[PDB]
Amino acid sequence: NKTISVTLGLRHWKTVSAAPPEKMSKSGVCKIATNVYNRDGGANPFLVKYE
């Protein structure tokens, strides 16, 4: 018969494990680089006992 147009078999739709297992509301990391504004040094504590 007449020519039929090709039907592109595009599927993709692999989705993504976007939903965490339960909620996986846990990505724990700690401050490491001694914060910023590293502040002063020993600030001469010394002792005050009356020698």
Binding site: P21, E22, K23, M24, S25, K26, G28
Partner: protein, 51 residues
């Protein structure tokens, strides 16, 4: 129970023209983790829960 909210106020044309203040109130929620400091939620140990 401040007596600024629970005291009856008459209409505009009567002796009592006072209005109830639009202040803010605080209610602490009594929960098992709020009963005692020794009972606290281990959020670090609960990464697979959605509280």
């Amino acid at each position: 129970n401040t007596s600024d909210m629970t005291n009856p106020t008459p209409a505009q044309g009567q002796d009592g023209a006072r209005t109830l203040p639009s202040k803010n109130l605080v209610l602490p929620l009594p929960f098992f983790f709020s009963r005692d400091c020794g009972l606290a939620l281990p959020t670090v140990v609960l990464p697979y829960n959605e509280i």
